[PDB]
Amino acid sequence: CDKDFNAIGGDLIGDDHFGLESEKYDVLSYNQEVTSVQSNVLPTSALGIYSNPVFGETTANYVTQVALVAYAPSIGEDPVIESAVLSIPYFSHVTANNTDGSHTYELDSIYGPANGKLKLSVYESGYQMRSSFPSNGTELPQYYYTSQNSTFDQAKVGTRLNDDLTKPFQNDQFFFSSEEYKTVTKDSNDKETTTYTAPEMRLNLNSAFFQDKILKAPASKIASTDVFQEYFRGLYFKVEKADGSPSNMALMDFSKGKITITYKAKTDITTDAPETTEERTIVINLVNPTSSGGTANLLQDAKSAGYSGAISSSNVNKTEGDERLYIKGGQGSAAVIKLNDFASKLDDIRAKNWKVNEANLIFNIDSDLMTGADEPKRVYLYDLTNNVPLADYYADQTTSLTVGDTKGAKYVFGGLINLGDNKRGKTYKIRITEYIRNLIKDKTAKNVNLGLVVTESIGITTSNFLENRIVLQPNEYFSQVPRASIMNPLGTILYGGKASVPDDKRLRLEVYYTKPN
Amino acid sequence: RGVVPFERFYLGGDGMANYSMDGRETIQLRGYPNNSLTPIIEDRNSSRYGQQIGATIYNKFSMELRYPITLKSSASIYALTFLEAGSSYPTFKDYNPFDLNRSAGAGLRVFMPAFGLLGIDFGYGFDALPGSTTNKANGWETHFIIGQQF
Amino acid sequence: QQGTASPYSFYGIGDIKFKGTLEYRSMAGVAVEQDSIHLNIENPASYASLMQTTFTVGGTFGTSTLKSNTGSAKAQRTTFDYLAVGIPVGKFGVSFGLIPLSSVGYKILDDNTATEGAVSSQLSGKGGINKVYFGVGYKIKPHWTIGADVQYNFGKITTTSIEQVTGVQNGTSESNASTLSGANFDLGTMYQTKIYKKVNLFTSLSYTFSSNLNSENVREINVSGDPDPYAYPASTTKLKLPSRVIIGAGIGESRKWLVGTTLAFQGEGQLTNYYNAMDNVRYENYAKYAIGGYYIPNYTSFTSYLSRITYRAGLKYEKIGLIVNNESIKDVGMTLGAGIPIPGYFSNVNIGIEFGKKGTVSSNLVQENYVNFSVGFSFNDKWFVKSKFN
Ligand SMILES: CCCCCCCCCCCCCC(=O)O[C@H](CCCCCCCCCCC)CC(=O)O[C@@H]1[C@@H](NC(=O)C[C@@H](CCCCCCCCCCC)OC(=O)CCCCCCCCCCC)[C@H](OC[C@H]2O[C@H](OP(=O)(O)O)[C@H](NC(=O)C[C@H](O)CCCCCCCCCCC)[C@@H](OC(=O)C[C@H](O)CCCCCCCCCCC)[C@@H]2O)O[C@H](CO[C@]2(C(=O)O)C[C@@H](O[C@]3(C(=O)O)C[C@@H](O)[C@@H](O)[C@@H]([C@H](O)CO)O3)[C@@H](O[C@H]3O[C@H]([C@@H](O)CO)[C@@H](OP(=O)(O)O)[C@H](O[C@H]4O[C@H]([C@@H](O)CO[C@H]5O[C@H]([C@@H](O)CO)[C@@H](O)[C@H](O)[C@@H]5O)[C@@H](OP(=O)(O)O)[C@H](O)[C@@H]4O)[C@@H]3O)[C@@H]([C@H](O)CO)O2)[C@H]1OP(=O)(O)O
Ligand SMILES: *[C@@H](O)[C@@H](COC(=O)CCCCCCCCCCCCCCCCC)OC(=O)CCCCCCCCCCCCCCCCC
Ligand SMILES: *C(=O)CCCCCCCCCCCCCCC
């Protein structure tokens, strides 16, 4: 039992031969607006109108391709459609188990006031979508951008399918509900079957439309997916502000959405051969946004005066930098970060045999400007030159302490918000120890440009292309943006690296060295 | 030329007789697992880090107090208490004969002509195993052997 | 697994561990009498006086409380002290064993947490120098013996210093390792006379020659997370072990009582390595003054067994030889012991308790109060007996 330490006699031992100290370096950071981005393979899409006090108002639409579970179906003889219901499950969590079975749910990923209402319109798309197209000897991929709302809105056929005026909660006064949709069926020979379904978007579509579109359609149109997709191109979801009510936006997973058509046929009969009818059902599933490229998220934003002015090319200084950094998700903006000061002294750092203990970038949030608006829960830093994650991202294998919180992983890398006692954001710290180590260790390495942008999930590290690449400098381009950034509709304001910014809030790189002597 | 890779020493655990023909010797040091005190490869990036290469030096010091409960020809049973300390080293330049892994405990031994020598021991390790990050005692250990495993 | 916890072990080659067997350590190192069942490792001439083969092993359990002007701390250490074998060969005597020359050990922690940007240090040390000896003694006369021995010194001293700032998670750990190897020679003589009736005058003189120690140093700096360590070029330094002259004299009746005094002086040495070089620490000559003896009520007693136990006691004043902050570090202590002889054999079990004070709290130094409990086993058996009646 002699494994205990003590604090007696520390002055008698000689001093070591290494000096642990930290250095501060300036950073060049400017704003770069994100123009129309690719919204074709987004795992989660936004549907609604979100009003942000600082950034502004953003309207999100969605277009998708429909598919049949089993092609070349046998609808039957003399089919009569009974109902056409579209169901899209909502992100919800059970909050209170109640008696008599049933449950109480709370909607998740809903942005905006809880009492918001929007005018939802579901139209039949008349614009054929493809996942890829042959080119001059090559098979190029098909990309749908966030600014193509006009193309899909002009090529829409008929009127909105959800035209049941008897239920205003599905049209003209739509609102994301949290009901449990209790259903009871005495089909158990007399016994009931109380079945409950989680909150979902249930809409009653025009029965007449589906009668001739599927139940009374030529067999040559529903024989395969290629012919069906050309016949039923897709569904277009349009949102507008309701009469005298605020608007809210929600993030949904349309991969689980489907429209079930319930009808009655004449049955296989031949035994009784009467005018009897049987109950049949056909399901028209929505294409998967990940396995198909026939889904686009039409995001339109009305940038505020302050946000538009800061990200404007006339108010951006690429030489000195910007005092305030406005980073917003979706078709918003990003920040270009260059460690020019560190590169200038990189020659002397490697000559003195200095070792890097840790490197970090601390982004301070502008609490005064960012007041009354929802703050992003995490930020992401990547390599803008190569459009790939930094070496520190791969080197960090830490998982969130909370069980089931996959969004809080890689806490060593950083990016998570540091809220104060007021429950408001205070700063974001990202560690780039591995990136700095490689620069000093490897002489052939080059200091690449770094991009800061809001992220929804740290796991999604893919990138989405821009319709038109931006020329940052003579031979520098801004062509892609992280896919997790487009999904996040929130944004944050941070202090820049300009020399005019106070040293206590200015953005600067802090490197902790082990100076051997 | 270097030391030969055979005829090495392995310390820790219940121990085993020199049954192998390659010269490998297993030394018993109660209170620790089997071969837990043998030096390991510390190159880290050698693709074989953590493997037990074998020791070239070893020294064990033990003290025991035994009391006979029965010493008949049919069955000889005696109890014992021990205080051991031992260590293994990779080379002569790292030989520290007084830097040992201490342990203590008690055990029971029964010898029957037909069933042979049977022994059960309980030892406590007062030191940490090599390569351990935390300097914490190894703890209690149980050793069972049949025959003269020396 | 360290042998000492004193911060003073950082300087020189560490703290002197071996100071004689429990039979002699309990008498403050006074080994004037020419014993027949005990091994006097410090004097090679005593090997000739052995009458039966001797096997000795010893261990100790030390308890110390470090005190400074800031606070106090408690530390305890357990170690194996020695292993020696003595073999009588006619008029000659041969002895071989393993003893610890010195030990390095300290675990100091400077906790500067709870404050962002504060460096926290975790100083630690381990290792020491060990000795292997082979000595031969000869009886020039029935009560006059001379002898010589050869000792090989070997060991490794490793010093580690890990520093971590409060904020960052990756700290640095500098480690210094030194391998020392060398040989020395010792000469001794013991003369015993009879001044008065039943009273004898014991005299013993021993001399140790100066030796050169070769040290191979390796200093490497490691930082958490970085897979490539920064290693300094290998260096080789030469150390010089000082010579020792031990003079002892005492009066007493064999198996009844004994009172003696010993004076040990050391010459000039160079124990400053590359890692322990300091400006506030100097070196001086080691000097030890000790007075001790034993008392046996009645060795040949059949009524009470307590009268057959050898009771030992001793006092000691040592000048370690290092001057820290212009203050000479001295060690003062008292020792008590008892030798219980196993019935029917010359083998015995030795028990001893030593307590003293080393260092001082003045001049920002550290004072150490220790209470060490030791146990020793001396086994004796007669060998080389020829069997007649062919
Ligand atoms: C009796 C009982 C039986 C026992 C018998 C044993 C006794 C017999 C004697 C044995 C000794 C024989 C040694 C020997 O010799 O044989 C050795 C083989 C021996 C076989 C023995 C067989 C035994 C049989 C037994 C049978 C049994 C039945 C091998 C050897 O040899 O290994 C040697 C190794 N020793 C051991 O391993 C032993 C081992 C021990 C092993 C045996 C253990 C046995 C124990 C078992 C018994 C147990 C029984 C129970 O120890 C240990 O394990 C630890 C201790 C053991 C602990 C024991 C505990 C016991 C416990 C018991 C408990 C119960 C040695 O260490 C030192 C010590 O050795 C022993 O002790 P230690 O080791 O310390 O312990 C001595 N003596 C001992 O007795 C100790 C014994 O243990 C004691 C025994 C104890 C017994 C106990 C008994 C117990 C039982 C009894 C019971 C009672 C000690 O004495 C002392 O103090 C001690 C004392 O006083 C001595 C007397 C003591 C006697 C004791 C009395 C008895 C008492 C007993 C009782 C008390 C002494 O201090 O290092 C040497 C390295 O030297 C070389 C080399 O290898 O050539 C050359 C060097 O140059 C010198 C020089 O020239 O002078 C050296 C110095 O002088 C110094 O001045 C130095 C300057 O500092 C330089 O700055 O220079 C230098 O290179 C340089 O030299 C050139 C020159 O020009 C200089 O300028 C340059 O050329 P250039 O530039 O062109 O001009 C070079 O550069 C060129 O090249 C480079 C490259 O390009 C080339 O590439 C590569 O190639 C190079 C080639 O060289 C390689 O070949 C490499 O080297 C390069 O690195 C490189 O990688 C470039 O370089 P870079 O710039 O890039 O860097 C450069 O650009 C340029 O090109 C380069 O710079 C160096 C390099 O730096 C290394 O990397 O390498 C080794 O080679 P060595 O040179 O031959 O000696
Ligand atoms: C602190 O946590 C504590 C350890 O706590 C534990 O977990 C307890 C450890 C297990 C206790 C022993 C369990 C088995 C019972 C029998 C014990 C063995 C007795 C043997 C006696 C006869 C010899 C065969 O820490 C401690 O308990 C501290 C222990 C300190 C012990 C100090 C005294 C040891 C003796 C000192 C001399 C060295 C021994 C060798 C003597 C001969 C010389 C060669
Ligand atoms: C914490 O360190 C508690 C003390 C560690 C255990 C003490 C027992 C050590 C055993 C040493 C045995 C030496 C050899 C005995 C006969 C040769």
Distinct helical segment count of chain B: 0
Largest sheet of chain B: 5 strands, antiparallel
Instruction: Report Rg of chain B.
Output: 17 Å
Form type of chain C: elongated
Unique ligands: ligand JSG, diacyl glycerol, palmitic acid
Could you explain the architecture of this structure?
Chain C: This is Long-chain fatty acid transport protein. The structure is cut from a larger assembly and holds chains A (517 residues), B (150 residues) and C (390 residues). Helices cover 11% and strands 37% of the residues of chain A. Chain A has 9 helices and 31 strands. Chain A has helices at residues 149-154, 207-215, 225-231, 305-311, 340-344, 346-351, 391-395, 433-441, 483-487, and strands at residues 18-26, 28-33, 45-52, 56-64, 66-68, 80-89, 92-94, 105-107, 110-111, 118-125, 132-134, 139-141, 156-157, 200-204, 234-241, 249-252, 258-265, 278-286, 296-303, 324-328, 333-338, 355-364, 379-383, 388-389, 414-419, 425-431, 450-454, 463-473, 476-482, 491-495, 508-516. In chain A, the strands form 8 sheets. In chain A, strands 3, 4, 9, 10, 13, 15, 16 and 19 form an 8-stranded antiparallel β-sheet that branches. Chain A has a 5-stranded antiparallel β-sheet with strand order 1-31-22-26-25. Chain A has a 5-stranded antiparallel β-sheet with strand order 2-21-27-23-24. In chain B, 0% of the residues lie in helices and 43% in strands. Chain B is mainly beta. Chain B is built from no helices and 7 strands. The longest helix of chain C is centred in the first third of the chain and has 4 residues, at 22-25. Chain C has 390 residues and is an all-beta fold. Chains in contact: A-B, A-C, B-C. The structure holds ligand JSG, diacyl glycerol (DGA) and palmitic acid.
Topology:
The structure is cut from a larger assembly and holds chains A (517 residues), B (150 residues) and C (390 residues).
Chain A: E1 18-26, E2 28-33, E3 45-52, E4 56-64, E5 66-68, E6 80-89, E7 92-94, E8 105-107, E9 110-111, E10 118-125, E11 132-134, E12 139-141, H1 149-154, E13 156-157, E14 200-204, H2 207-215, H3 225-231, E15 234-241, E16 249-252, E17 258-265, E18 278-286, E19 296-303, H4 305-311, E20 324-328, E21 333-338, H5 340-344, H6 346-351, E22 355-364, E23 379-383, E24 388-389, H7 391-395, E25 414-419, E26 425-431, H8 433-441, E27 450-454, E28 463-473, E29 476-482, H9 483-487, E30 491-495, E31 508-516
Antiparallel strand pairs in A: 1-31, 2-21, 3-4, 3-16, 4-15, 4-19, 5-18, 6-14, 6-17, 7-8, 9-16, 10-13, 10-15, 11-12, 17-18, 20-30, 21-27, 22-26, 22-31, 23-24, 23-27, 25-26, 28-29
Chain B: E1 9-11, E2 25-27, E3 57-71, E4 76-89, E5 101-112, E6 116-125, E7 139-146
Parallel strand pairs in B: 1-2
Antiparallel strand pairs in B: 3-4, 4-5, 5-6, 6-7
Chain C: E1 15-16, H1 22-25, E2 53-67, E3 72-89, E4 92-103, E5 106-110, E6 119-141, E7 144-165, E8 172-196, E9 199-208, E10 211-223, E11 230-231, E12 235-241, E13 244-253, E14 257-266, E15 281-283, E16 287-295, E17 310-324, E18 327-341, E19 348-358, E20 367-381
Antiparallel strand pairs in C: 1-4, 2-3, 2-20, 3-4, 4-6, 5-6, 6-7, 7-8, 8-9, 8-10, 9-13, 10-11, 10-12, 13-14, 14-16, 15-17, 16-17, 17-18, 18-19, 19-20
The structure holds ligand JSG, diacyl glycerol and palmitic acid.
